Amino acid sequence: ELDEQQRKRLEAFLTQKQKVGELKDDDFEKISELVVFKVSHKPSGLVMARKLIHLEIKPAIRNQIIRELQVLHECNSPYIVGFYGAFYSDGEISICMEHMDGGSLDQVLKKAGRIPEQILGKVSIAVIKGLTYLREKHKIMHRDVKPSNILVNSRGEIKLCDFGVSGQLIDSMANSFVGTRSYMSPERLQGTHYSVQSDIWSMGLSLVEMAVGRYPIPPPDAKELELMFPMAIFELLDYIVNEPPPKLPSAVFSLEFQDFVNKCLIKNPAERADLKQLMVHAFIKRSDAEEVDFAGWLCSTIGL
Amino acid sequence: TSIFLQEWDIPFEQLEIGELIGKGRFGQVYHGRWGEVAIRLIDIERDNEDQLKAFKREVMAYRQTRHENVVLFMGACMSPPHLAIITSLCKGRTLYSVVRDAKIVLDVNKTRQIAQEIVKGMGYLHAKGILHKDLKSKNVFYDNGKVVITDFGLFSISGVLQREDKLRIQNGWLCHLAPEIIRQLSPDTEEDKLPFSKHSDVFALGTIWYELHAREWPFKTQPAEAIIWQMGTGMKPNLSQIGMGKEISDILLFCWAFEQEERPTFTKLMDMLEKLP
């Protein structure tokens, strides 16, 4: 849990720390959409991304959300994106962030066909160190791991975002969006006590999706597996809870990788591999000590 | 293709439009004068004949309603694309706000009384073959004992669900939906096509009975997906954690019954609420 070439740019982040001061709307000029926007700060030439969370809600509560949010200035590590400030303008709280040239791993997946195992090797260490950092350095679990909230850059870093700092902001947003791709753990759907074990399941499920190029529930029939190489919300969630978990195809992926996802996708969260059980696993100790130009893989596939 | 305001039994000379009453997902709701009134301005596609005579479908059903526990439907002029539904204006506060104000005592005797009022009105609507389809505490009004239902039938023509293959789910909606409805929510779900029923409406009353005593919605802790799965497979709270007796808790077991045919009609529910301590 230390490296000097990432102690280099952690600190050069805290040098653009001083440049921001405080922030509100007119400082920012919109560039493009990515809901969140690409922004251009004016007192400080930094190019950021700005969240917009429309909330329609009391005096005292905002003050206590933004002060609950101020915990993100404190947390810093090479496996978590960069936080600048939080303010409220015009019925919409706005979190301004570090911007990411590459986008979410959902972004890159739909442009690529599938993502190779060697890269998701390195992706897996980024996630596991991130979650390990946040638990033992801040006593918080992510609560929402999915491909769209893992972001990558043309420099080569992988870090997580959109995790739960403020117990209230959870309570105050009025409506959630429920589609056909769920990453909630079976223990979280049943209303049982949960730990960072849930984030491990969410990681496992995202990995098999990225390795196959398709959301894996319900699993495909023999015809679509050959090719690759109408469902109601409730019965998808019920599939997650009662049918066996998805698994990678035995043919095209290494044993170390298959056993990795299989341990992340165990239903019983007690038998599921815990955070650092995963870091002595064969698959990532093999993957840690490999040379893959992540920056090069990215720029060639999305085109930048 | 046209509804005129001269078509109504309430003689109408002029209609003044005042300030907005509140935010809401279905049209805007202004103060108005006629007597004092509540005007709901809805907008519709210019040339969607389906949506329109299906709106007209609904409103003159309402023209036959009058009941002391049902807000007075007064008129609906329709010169497309601009619609308007005009009802009596409710004094006092909504049941939602009253339940969530700690300065108001809600003893077991009062909660039985509020619930019997809502039931009487719902029985009337059902007797005339009108389903509510959105009964909830933001749609009930309470002014020192006077209890009035509002917004019945609007959900069919509402459009409150309307992202890409992602259904928008408001807080506190799901915990009103009976399991037969929960089990088919999908990003393709249309308000026109959900299986609402008289039984679904009794379920929604059950949610209000929980809310009257816990003074919060059920499944408050939990996210939307957890609520869908928990309610689809039939899991439901009780109120023994706050020291409520058996009778109060039995109301829920009946109203929230998993198979529809086991829940009472509002007439039977009216009896069950009579026999409380």
Ligand SMILES: CC(=O)Nc1cccc(-n2c(=O)n(C3CC3)c(=O)c3c(Nc4ccc(I)cc4F)n(C)c(=O)c(C)c32)c1
């Ligand atoms: C029941 C339950 O699990 N609720 C839940 C669970 C996990 C997440 C959320 N939640 C969320 O979903 N988003 C997503 C929808 C956009 C958030 O952005 C989001 C958020 N922002 C954010 C955070 C960190 C950084 I570095 C940048 C950011 F922009 N912060 C600060 C939160 O504290 C929460 C709690 C968020 C809600």
Ligand SMILES: Nc1ncnc2c1ncn2[C@@H]1O[C@H](COP(=O)(O)OP(=O)(O)NP(=O)(O)O)[C@@H](O)[C@H]1O
């Ligand atoms: N800092 C960022 N840099 C680049 N792209 C971003 C950034 N934050 C978000 N995005 C992108 O913005 C889009 C929408 O993100 P978001 O509003 O968080 O919703 P979502 O990812 O589709 N699902 P969710 O994150 O759970 O709300 C996605 O394509 C993200 O990759």
Ligand SMILES: Nc1ncnc2c1ncn2[C@@H]1O[C@H](COP(=O)(O)OP(=O)(O)NP(=O)(O)O)[C@@H](O)[C@H]1O
């Ligand atoms: N007849 C009425 N008298 C007084 N206030 C009313 C009346 N009808 C609606 N309101 C208020 O007008 C606002 C909008 O109502 P409405 O459009 O039904 O939204 P809502 O039902 O409260 N929430 P939702 O339907 O879930 O989006 C709310 O503040 C209501 O309390």
Ligand SMILES: [Mg+2]
């Ligand atoms: Mg996100």
Ligand SMILES: [Mg+2]
């Ligand atoms: Mg209402």
